[PDB]
Every structure is written in C-alpha cells, then in structure tokens.
C-alpha cells in the first residue's frame, strides 16, 4: 500500500547566503542518513 513519506526541502537562497554548496549538502545527507559502502577489509582471510 501507499504510505506517508518525508520530504526534505533545501533552500538554494539560504544555502548561497551561508556559502554552502548544493553538492556538499547532498553528500552530507547521503552519507549521514543513507550510509555508504566505502572499501574492503580482511577478516580471518576473507574480504569484507
């Protein structure tokens, strides 16, 4: 079924007023909330 969702609205005007990049805002949101897979490591001989 269709469900409520939350919408984030980012103001270009205030972002420019504070000297913050749209791309920088997007990256911060993406990592902080969505999470990201960065690279690998080895755990008892197996890459993870």
């Amino acid at each position: 079924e269709d469900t409520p969702q939350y919408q984030i609205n980012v103001d270009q005007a205030q972002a420019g007023a504070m000297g913050v990049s749209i791309a920088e805002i997007n990256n911060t949101m993406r990592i902080a909330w969505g999470g990201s897979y960065i690279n690998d490591f080895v755990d008892r001989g197996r890459v993870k």
Binding site: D43, R44, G45, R46
Partner: protein, 48 residues
C-alpha cells in the same frame, strides 16, 4: 593432465582462517611423515 602424470595429486585446505604459517606447518608435518613411509615415493610440495 593425461600423459606425464603417474603420481597422485592432492590439495590440502585451510578451512578455517588459521593463516599461511599454520597451513605450511601442517604441510611440513604431512611431508615429514610421508618421507618415513615405505609405500610412498618422492612426495613433494608443488609450489614456491
């Protein structure tokens, strides 16, 4: 795999992540026992 292979071939496996050193120690023990056996001839490791 057909004309020059009279002898047997086997793969000893490190099933748990015990490291290279334990694996080669086990290989060494196997080879050492096999050297002292009448029915087996010329058993060697097949790698560097």
């Amino acid at each position: 795999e057909l004309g020059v292979t009279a002898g047997f071939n086997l793969q000893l496996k490190d099933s748990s992540g015990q490291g290279h050193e334990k694996l080669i120690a086990a290989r060494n023990t196997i080879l050492g026992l096999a050297s002292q056996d009448k029915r087996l001839v010329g058993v060697r490791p097949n790698g560097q």
